[PDB]
Design a binder for this molecule. Structure first.
Ligand SMILES: CNc1nc(CCc2ccccc2)nc2sc(C(=O)O)c(C)c12
Ligand SMILES: CNc1nc(CCc2ccccc2)nc2sc(C(=O)O)c(C)c12
Ligand SMILES: CNc1nc(CCc2ccccc2)nc2sc(C(=O)O)c(C)c12
Lengths: 192, 192, 192
């Protein structure tokens, strides 16, 4: 079950958006924790979510909050369509925004952000603490490494792999594998 | 409340699409006014909508029809997802198409068109009589000026501002501020 | 009506996705036929679908299966929004994925794939056995020829026509007519 209330850590734009998704799930109230009220392990053990966009910082908090013993839940909007054979790591800090689609046998690891109207096609693997931005789309069988960032309206052709800690620019179209980390921009996306 | 019938002004493709949205809202019938039957202030005071894509012309009509005393309503498809803290100017000629998403504290001014599957992220401001085309996406905290046109599948990176009367080309990815008006195309979008 | 069961021909990623759409429609069970169990005309006459992405091969099978007397149905996800005045050829092997939008008076011919979150605007014509990929968008009054392939996140400006057997690259933005076949890539899309 879910608690009646939920802690949203982060009070900037991303947090307001997470507040909307949590309410859509039926949480009656969001208690924002400042990120800049303040956090300590003694708070009533409500469900928890880290509403910080930056992958590295979100991860360091996630590491903290877990060790302090809170359940970092997933915030999944009801309008997200998720194949029954897709796997989304449970109680793993994952945000899935409105009108996201995740298709057959895709895997979403912990800490991932799947932002508004993004698409994860069949058989993809989205590595932990990745951020698939607004409208970004992975064709089938794509491997997104840990801590990757796919910019707004970017896309990845099918059967491609993107190395851990890479950034795909807003609007960029990735058409080849990238085994070493980098920043890739344009159509086709090129190392920048 | 809404009247049982609604005037759709414009009989081209955009008008047929507005007819679909008005019916989705539950209007029982759309009475098309020619734009090329003809309009005069004496018609029964049904709800009204200007189904003209061009921002300048839509605005001049809007100016007319209001002064003649008709309520120019908003046509909002039921599948649009609109944050409770987003503000959409009421009875202000705004069209919101299927699967549009408008997130926390965004503001949509009068006369705007938000076309199919477009995305207005949190805290954006879309200036009056703008047209955000099919699939076009504004990241968070974007300011779109009055009478702007964002082309199909274009996008704007977060915290950017686009000057009044600018055009962002189809497919273009805007990555920097643009304080003076222009036509911007490509990935990254460049002054054309 | 639809039969209780349906044959899905093709057992790769595309087939798993078609299995999801068929179930969403309420088929109780998908019987996969190997494409590599095996097919012959004597099987119980359940509804049939060709879950092969390649346009040429899908067509040759479609030609076969029809001549063997099976009804090749359409698989249309419930979350697809299809104008009442749009025409989708019935029992014509058409796949329409989640969150697809087809607007007023558009026409979808037999064998077309409209993949996840794609958009077919008003008055378009999508020619038979075309594949409009993930997130690809046709503005209003676009003519897509037979056996065309529009890549992930590509788009076509309004009132354009694309010649039979053309390919529009992933991410590409087509801004001019193309009366002779080709492969078009980039923003703007250029012959490659
Ligand atoms: C510096 N910030 C960014 N930079 C680029 C790449 C810009 C670029 C550079 C050169 C060519 C094309 C694009 N894309 C994106 S997407 C994005 C988001 O919220 O989706 C952000 C914040 C960025
Ligand atoms: C001339 N009409 C247009 N021009 C361009 C820009 C074309 C361009 C030029 C150079 C490089 C890239 C793109 N985009 C768009 S979007 C669009 C729509 O309904 O979304 C239209 C009617 C246009
Ligand atoms: C070779 N396969 C592809 N190639 C290109 C074009 C790559 C390109 C080349 C040069 C410039 C830009 C893009 N687009 C796409 S979309 C796509 C899909 O499932 O949507 C595929 C399988 C491809």
């Amino acid at each position: 079950a879910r608690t009646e209330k939920i802690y949203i850590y982060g009070a900037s734009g991303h947090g307001l958006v997470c507040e909307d998704v949590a309410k859509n799930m039926g949480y009656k109230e969001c208690i924002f924790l400042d990120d800049f009220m303040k956090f300590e392990s003694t708070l009533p053990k409500y469900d928890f979510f880290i509403a910080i966009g930056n992958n590295e910082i979100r991860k360091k908090i996630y590491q903290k909050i877990s060790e302090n013993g809170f359940k970092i839940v997933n915030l999944i909007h009801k309008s997200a369509l998720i194949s029954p054979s897709a796997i989304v790591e449970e109680n793993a800090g994952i945000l899935i925004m409105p009108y996201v689609v995740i298709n057959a046998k895709a895997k979403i690891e912990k800490g991932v952000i799947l932002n508004t109207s993004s698409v994860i096609e069949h058989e993809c693997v989205i590595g932990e603490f990745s951020h698939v931005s607004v409208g970004a789309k992975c064709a089938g069988n794509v491997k997104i490494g840990k801590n990757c960032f796919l910019g707004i309206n970017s896309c990845v052709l099918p059967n491609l792999s993107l190395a851990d800690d890479s950034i795909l620019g807003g609007g960029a179209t990735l058409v080849k594998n990238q085994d070493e980390k980098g920043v890739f921009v344009g159509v086709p996306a090129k190392r920048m």
